[PDB]
Amino acid sequence: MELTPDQQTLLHFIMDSYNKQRMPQEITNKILKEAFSAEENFLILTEMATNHVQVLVEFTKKLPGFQTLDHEDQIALLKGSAVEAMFLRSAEIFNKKLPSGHSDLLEARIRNSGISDEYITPMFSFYKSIGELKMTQEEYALLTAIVILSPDRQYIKDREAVEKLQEPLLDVLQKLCKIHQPENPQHFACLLGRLTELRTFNHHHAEMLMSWRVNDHKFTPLLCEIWDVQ
């Protein structure tokens, strides 16, 4: 049931790459310090998402075997996973322990950010369900890698080549669930099942962004390539 020396090597390598992301405390400190207008909050999201995509591309490039894949499939994997990775990272930040009352204010600040009520409810439903799983940093890093190397993505020419890269990451995650949560044997299937709910945000992400209570929906050229906007 224990990790092999190769799997421990793979896990620490994924962890070092995952940790190069913007610190959660840095993000929560800005949202908790001052209450911003819907216009200011849209600009905050656009800058936050641009940095996330940039760091995600660097994390994706370091995933073992990713560089050996067909260049057209590489783009298909990045484009098909960018939104899901953003929501998984947002869920991780939201569930990080904060001093008494700060998490209540964080939720209230996100509710009043500018997004339509229609989209706020399923977003918090996902964050709370991810939170009830009580995932470790290693589980978040592997799940992100598993999301990126999904063979079921649109326009993928060689599905088997993507499968071969995802399988060792799924194996490491399964072993970590058994070690971290031996009390809950449903833990690994719980995480995997939460990826289908993650996929639902892809279909409605463009509608979610355009429904933001602002006059101008301005996006960066990089965000326009990753999202179905402008």
Binding site: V57, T60, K61, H71, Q74, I75, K79, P221, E225, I226
Partner: peptide, 10 residues
């Protein structure tokens, strides 16, 4: 079409 993504990847 996705030249910024292609650039960051390569």
């Amino acid at each position: 079409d996705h030249q910024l993504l292609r650039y960051l990847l390569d």
